[PDB]
Amino acid sequence: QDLVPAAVEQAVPIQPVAGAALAAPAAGQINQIDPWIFQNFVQCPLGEFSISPRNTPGEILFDLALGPGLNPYLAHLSAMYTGWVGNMEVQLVLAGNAFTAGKVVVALVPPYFPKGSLTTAQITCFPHVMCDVRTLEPIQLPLLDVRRVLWHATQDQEESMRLVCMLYTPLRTNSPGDESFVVSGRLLSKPAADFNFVYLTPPIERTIYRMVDLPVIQPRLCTHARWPAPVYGLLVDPSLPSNPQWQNGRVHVDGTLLGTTPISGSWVSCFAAEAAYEFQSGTGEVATFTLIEQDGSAYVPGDRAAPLGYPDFSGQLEIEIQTETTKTGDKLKVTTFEMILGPTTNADQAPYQGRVFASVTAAASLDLVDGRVRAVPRSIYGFQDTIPEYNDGLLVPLAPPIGPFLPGEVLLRFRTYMRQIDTADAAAEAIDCALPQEFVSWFASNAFTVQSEALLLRYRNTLTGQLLFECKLYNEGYIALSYSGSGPLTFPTDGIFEVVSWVPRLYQLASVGS
Which residues of this chain interact with a copy of itself, rule CB under 8 A? 13-15, 17-18, 21-30, 82-83, 108, 110-114, 121-122, 125-127, 144-156, 198-204, 299-302, 350, 353-355, 391, 393-397
For residue 106, the minimal CB distance to a copy of itself (Å) is 16
Q: Which is nearer to Ca ion, 137 or 425 (CB)?
A: 425
DSSP string, 240-299: S-SS----SS-B-TTSPBPTT--SSGGGTT-EEEEEEEEE-SSS-EEEEEEEE-TTS---
Q: Which is nearer to Ca ion, 105 or 418 (CB)?
A: 418
Q: Does 428 bind Ca ion (CB under 5 A)?
A: no
Q: Does 137 bind Ca ion (CB under 5 A)?
A: no
- CA atoms of 369 and 325, how far apart (whole Å): 6
For residue 312, the minimal CB distance to Ca ion (Å) is 19
For residue 429, the minimal CB distance to Ca ion (Å) is 5
> Residues touching Ca ion: how many (CB under 5 A)?
2
358 binds, among a copy of itself, Ca ion, none (CB under 5 to 8 A by kind): none
For residue 76, the minimal CB distance to a copy of itself (Å) is 17
Q: Does 423 bind Ca ion (CB under 5 A)?
A: no
Tell which one of 59, 213, 422, 498 touches Ca ion (CB under 5 A).
Answer: 422
Q: Distance between the two ends of the chain, CA-based, in angstroms?
A: 69
- CA atoms of 215 and 411, how far apart (whole Å): 21
For residue 155, the minimal CB distance to a copy of itself (Å) is 6
Q: Does 425 bind Ca ion (CB under 5 A)?
A: yes
Distance of CA 260 to the CA centre of its chain: 17
- CA atoms of 451 and 329, how far apart (whole Å): 65
- CA atoms of 215 and 213, how far apart (whole Å): 7
- CA atoms of 292 and 373, how far apart (whole Å): 10
13 binds, among a copy of itself, Ca ion, none (CB under 5 to 8 A by kind): a copy of itself
For residue 151, the minimal CB distance to a copy of itself (Å) is 5
Q: Which of 358, 348, 357 is nearest to 393 (CA)?
A: 348
Q: Which is nearer to Ca ion, 241 or 397 (CB)?
A: 241
Q: Does 426 bind Ca ion (CB under 5 A)?
A: no
DSSP-derived letter for residue 37 is G
Q: Which is nearer to a copy of itself, 296 or 302 (CB)?
A: 302
Question: ω before 178 within 30° of 0 (cis)?
Answer: yes
- Residue 143: other Cβ atoms inside 10 A: 23
Taking each continuous run of H as one helix and of E as one strand, the counts in the chain are 2, 25
Residue 350 β-bridge partners: 355
334 binds, among Ca ion, a copy of itself, none (CB under 5 to 8 A by kind): none
391 binds, among Ca ion, a copy of itself, none (CB under 5 to 8 A by kind): a copy of itself
Q: Which residues bind Ca ion (CB under 5 A)?
A: 422, 425
